[PDB]
Enzyme design. Structure first.
Site, short mmCIF file in Angstrom:
data_model
loop_
_atom_site.label_atom_id
_atom_site.label_comp_id
_atom_site.label_asym_id
_atom_site.label_seq_id
_atom_site.Cartn_x
_atom_site.Cartn_y
_atom_site.Cartn_z
N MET A 69 11.20 0.41 -9.44
CA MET A 69 12.35 0.56 -8.53
C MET A 69 12.35 -0.69 -7.63
O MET A 69 11.66 -0.71 -6.61
CB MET A 69 12.17 1.88 -7.73
CG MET A 69 12.06 3.13 -8.62
SD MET A 69 13.52 3.49 -9.63
CE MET A 69 14.70 4.13 -8.34
N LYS A 120 0.71 2.53 -10.07
CA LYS A 120 0.05 3.08 -8.89
C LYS A 120 -1.41 3.30 -9.23
O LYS A 120 -1.71 3.91 -10.26
CB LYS A 120 0.70 4.41 -8.42
CG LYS A 120 0.06 4.97 -7.15
CD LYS A 120 0.96 5.96 -6.39
CE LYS A 120 1.44 5.47 -5.04
NZ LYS A 120 2.31 6.44 -4.33
N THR A 126 0.85 -1.17 0.00
CA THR A 126 0.00 0.00 0.00
C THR A 126 0.89 1.23 0.00
O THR A 126 1.51 1.56 1.02
CB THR A 126 -1.01 -0.08 1.16
OG1 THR A 126 -1.98 -1.07 0.80
CG2 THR A 126 -1.72 1.24 1.43
N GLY A 127 0.98 1.88 -1.16
CA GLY A 127 1.72 3.12 -1.32
C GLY A 127 0.95 4.23 -0.63
O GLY A 127 -0.26 4.07 -0.38
N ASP A 150 8.63 17.95 0.21
CA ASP A 150 8.59 16.73 1.04
C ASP A 150 9.77 15.84 0.73
O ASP A 150 9.63 14.60 0.60
CB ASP A 150 7.26 15.93 1.05
CG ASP A 150 7.14 15.03 2.30
OD1 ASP A 150 7.93 15.21 3.26
OD2 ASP A 150 6.30 14.09 2.28
#
Ligand SMILES: Nc1nccn2c([C@@H]3CC[C@H]4COC(=O)N4C3)nc(-c3ccc(C(=O)Nc4cc(C(F)(F)F)ccn4)cc3)c12
Ligand SMILES: CN(C)CCCC(=O)N1CCC[C@H]1c1nc(-c2ccc(C(=O)Nc3nccs3)cc2)c2c(N)nccn12
Length: 254
Positions: free
Chosen positions: A86, A39, A19-20, A130
């Protein structure tokens, strides 16, 4: 979105990665050959139409050390974001895995990779807003790349005094956060100011408290991260200067 529109028929889902932040992320292939991350933009999670400035950002910014957008699937719901895959996942998780037994030359290389992406974002007058190890990803070759760029709970522990007191964002507040991200790398993923709350961190930072030198950081590496934390924003280096300083330390130490 013109040439950025990917036909979802070309995708094949191989495994759920987890869960991104903003929805489910899966590993998959495009036209059966190319590795991709997919995503799934969570249903009614954030604003869309007007908030799709983030896709304009992802569609106009590109660098070898930024996670690359390949395309989007917007003629449907949930929306899919197709990006570079990635394999080592999030930098913060990668640092915490004690099995890699990192050497300090590998840690300085992770700093250099992020510094290159940031010098590029600086050159385009873009602020990440961020920058932290949680928003960096690592590929199968151990190359670190910056992700979630300018996406969009406040990152108090990565913010300089002028941001916490006055919301004074500048290229120098990203410099400050980068110094904190170098500290996350050299401490192997410790939480900055881990003994303090966010409120206690903001008061200590306003009083001149700074993160200690991690054991794995040499005095020369520490000087580079500490230079990002000058109280006066104009005394902090640019990312171009930090990159030349990191390259110098890699040539000297290595
Ligand atoms: N490319 C990736 N590869 C491998 C793993 N990845 C993960 C893991 C999820 C599970 C956690 C748990 O463990 C771990 O390693 N984690 C990392 N997230 C991404 C990834 C994929 C896509 C985006 C993405 O779409 N970014 C984006 C999206 C927007 C937009 F369009 F939505 F606004 C704007 C800006 N950036 C971000 C991260 C990726
Ligand atoms: C056509 N051939 C090459 C097929 C290659 C295979 C292929 O098409 N693939 C494999 C994975 C998903 C899909 C895909 N990749 C991309 C893409 C875009 C930009 C860059 C880039 O490097 N951009 C830069 N900009 C500035 C500097 S570098 C690299 C890839 C795009 C795209 N724009 N729309 C649709 C599908 N897309």
């Amino acid at each position: 979105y013109g040439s950025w529109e990917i036909d979802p028929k070309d995708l094949t889902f191989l495994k759920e990665l987890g869960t991104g932040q903003f929805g489910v992320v899966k590993y998959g292939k495009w036209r059966g050959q190319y590795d991709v991350a997919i995503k799934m933009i969570k249903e009614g999670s954030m604003s869309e139409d007007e908030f799709i400035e983030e896709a304009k950002v992802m569609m106009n910014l590109s660098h070898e050390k930024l996670v690359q957008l390949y395309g989007v699937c917007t003629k449907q719901r949930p929306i899919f974001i197709i990006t570079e895959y990635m394999a080592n996942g999030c930098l913060l998780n990668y640092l915490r895995e004690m099995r890699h037994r990192f050497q300090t030359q590998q840690l300085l290389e992770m700093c250099k990779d992020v510094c290159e992406a940031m010098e590029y974002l600086e050159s385009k007058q873009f602020l990440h807003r961020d920058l932290a190890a949680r928003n960096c990803l690592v590929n199968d070759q151990g190359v670190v790349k910056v992700s979630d760029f300018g996406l969009s709970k406040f990152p108090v522990r990565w913010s300089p005094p002028e941001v916490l007191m006055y919301s004074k964002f500048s290229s120098k507040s990203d410099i400050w956060a980068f110094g904190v991200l170098m500290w996350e790398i050299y401490s192997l993923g410790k939480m900055p100011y881990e003994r303090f709350t966010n409120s206690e961190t903001a008061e200590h930072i306003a009083q001149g408290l700074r993160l200690y030198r991690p054991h794995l950081a040499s005095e020369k590496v520490y000087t580079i991260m500490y230079s990002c934390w000058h109280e006066k924003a104009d005394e902090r280096p640019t990312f171009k200067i930090l990159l030349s300083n990191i390259l110098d330390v890699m040539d000297e130490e290595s």
